[PDB]
């Protein structure tokens, strides 16, 4: 099936288009192509600095009647410098304005770490450390709950939350809405079995980010492992007459995950959508799971000192 049911009773497309690092001069055409070929979920964020250009694409395709607003599933995220109760609404509203939407289908707390508010996304002290916010995740969650009750967003969720942090929200006194989604890094080198099982056990849908191992990540190094070039994964793809990327996308789909590969290349945008026509075997799935090495693309390395830094815990 192409959509998964969320605990808010809305349906979410299991395949979306990622937009981190998509250049502003290329992302409007990328999102136009993606909607033309069938994508109905766009993953965005204010920190990516391209929401205006994403929005231009969405609005044109609504105008052209290629799609209806109800058929789209648009996702954005609250940056770390906006965890303050009094800043959350304006951050959401700026995203809405830029995307030229009147609601978001899903708004996520981007990280459990809150940072000092201000112009800088990574505010630093004179010694180079990121300056934190004294706001805690539970008060940030209540501010997200307000957004639902104001009609700005249909669902709220979290991202890069470890199992104890998810539990902290689930156990929040006075909890009004559970998180619908936990968006986390997930691919054959970081298979996340524990955190996924916990989230699914609670009714929280997991979205897999960097599913191709983010080969365009700014800090990539030639000696890092490469999913797209892994000959073991290439061999599974060849067996199935699909590309390696297509296997990497289908793999989380069969774990009941949502997945959000990024591309600004039209050919690849289309390739990446052609994953509803084949099935990996259970053996294939277990083999791909065996490649785990707890290798992370996104570990927020500039702020491992934060109280709420998520990746010291084992999961
Ligand atoms: N919540 C968070 O903290 C968080 C963190 C990281 C990512 N995310 C989200 O997850 C999305 C996906 O993760 P990501 O951007 O890190 O990386 P990714 O989707 O794993 O990999 C994107 C890279 O793969 C290339 N690529 C795409 N399709 C390909 C194909 N079929 N064959 C060969 N290469 C292909 C892209 O190139 P081209 O673009 O040149 O075609 C780009 O260089 C992000 O864009 C963002 O929306 C969220
Ligand atoms: N270093 C990290 O782990 C994160 C990753 C990350 N990419 C992403 O999609 N979400 C993120 O937060 C990102 C994006 C940025 F625009 C800037 C920094 C940045 O850092």
CA 178-107-36 angle, 5° bins: 125
Please confirm, yes or no, whether 48 is among the known catalytic residues: yes
DSSP string for 252-291: HHTTT-EE--B---HHHHHHHH--SS----HHHHHHHHTT
Residues 144 and 172: beta-carbon distance below 8 Å:
no
Please tell me the distance between residue 298's alpha carbon and the centre of ligand 2 in angstroms: 7
CATH number of the domain that residue 117 is part of: 3.20.20.100
Q: Could you count the other beta carbons within 10 Å of the beta carbon of residue 27?
A: 27
Contacts of 230 (CB under 8 A, 6+ apart): 188, 244, 291
What experimental approach yielded this model?
X-ray
Shortest CA distance to 129 belongs to which of 299, 303, 301? Answer: 303
For residue 214, say whether it is annotated as part of any ligand binding site. yes
In angstroms, the CA 15 to CA 260 distance is: 6
Per DSSP (E only), the strands in 27-155 are: 41-43, 73-78, 106-109
| CA dihedral sign, ordered 309, 313, 314, 315 | negative
Measured from the CA of 272, which atom of ligand 1 is nearest? 31
Q: Is any atom of ligand 2 closer than 6 Å to the C-beta of 62?
A: no
Which ligand sits nearest to residue 271's alpha carbon? Answer: 1
Element (H, E) at 246: helix 244-253
Please tell me the distance between residue 20's alpha carbon and the centre of ligand 1 in angstroms: 7
Residues 288 and 236: beta-carbon distance below 8 Å:
yes
| Mutational test site, ligand 2, from 23, 24, 43, 47, max ligand atoms within 8 Å of CB | 47
Element (H, E) at 184: strand 181-185
For the chain, how many structural domains are there in total? 1
- Domain enclosing residue 177, as ranges: 1-315
Please tell me the distance between residue 278's alpha carbon and the centre of ligand 2 in angstroms: 32
Resolution of the structure in the document, Å: 1.5
């Amino acid at each position: 099936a192409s959509r998964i049911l969320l605990n808010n009773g809305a349906k979410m497309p299991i395949l979306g288009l990622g937009t981190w690092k998509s250049p502003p001069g290329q992302v409007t055409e990328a999102v136009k192509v993606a909607i033309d070929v069938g994508y109905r979920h766009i993953d965005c964020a204010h920190v990516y600095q391209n929401e205006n250009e994403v929005g231009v694409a969405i609005q044109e395709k609504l105008r052209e009647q290629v799609v209806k607003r109800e058929e789209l599933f648009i996702v954005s995220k609250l940056w770390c410098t906006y965890h303050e109760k009094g800043l959350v609404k304006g951050a959401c509203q700026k995203t809405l304005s830029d995307l030229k939407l009147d609601y978001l289908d899903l708004y996520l707390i981007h990280w459990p770490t809150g940072f000092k508010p201000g112009k800088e996304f990574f505010p630093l002290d004179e010694s180079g450390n990121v300056v934190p916010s004294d706001t805690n995740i539970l008060d940030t969650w209540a501010a997200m709950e307000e957004l639902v009750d104001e009609g700005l967003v249909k669902a709220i969720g979290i991202s890069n939350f470890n199992h104890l942090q998810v539990e902290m929200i689930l156990n929040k006194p006075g909890l009004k809405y559970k998180p619908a989604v936990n968006q986390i890094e997930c691919h054959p080198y970081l298979t996340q079995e524990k955190l996924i099982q916990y989230c699914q056990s609670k009714g929280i849908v997991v979205t897999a980010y960097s599913p191709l191992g983010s080969p365009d990540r700014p800090w990539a190094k030639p000696e890092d492992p490469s999913l797209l070039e892994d000959p073991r994964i290439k061999a599974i793809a060849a067996k199935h007459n699909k590309t390696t990327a297509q296997v990497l996308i289908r793999f989380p789909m069969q774990r009941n995950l949502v997945v959000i590969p990024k591309s600004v290349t039209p050919e690849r945008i289309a390739e990446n959508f052609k994953v509803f026509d084949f099935e990996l075997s259970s053996q294939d799935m277990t083999t791909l799971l065996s490649y785990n090495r707890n290798w992370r693309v996104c570990a927020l390395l500039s702020d491992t000192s934060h109280k709420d830094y998520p990746f010291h815990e084992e999961f």
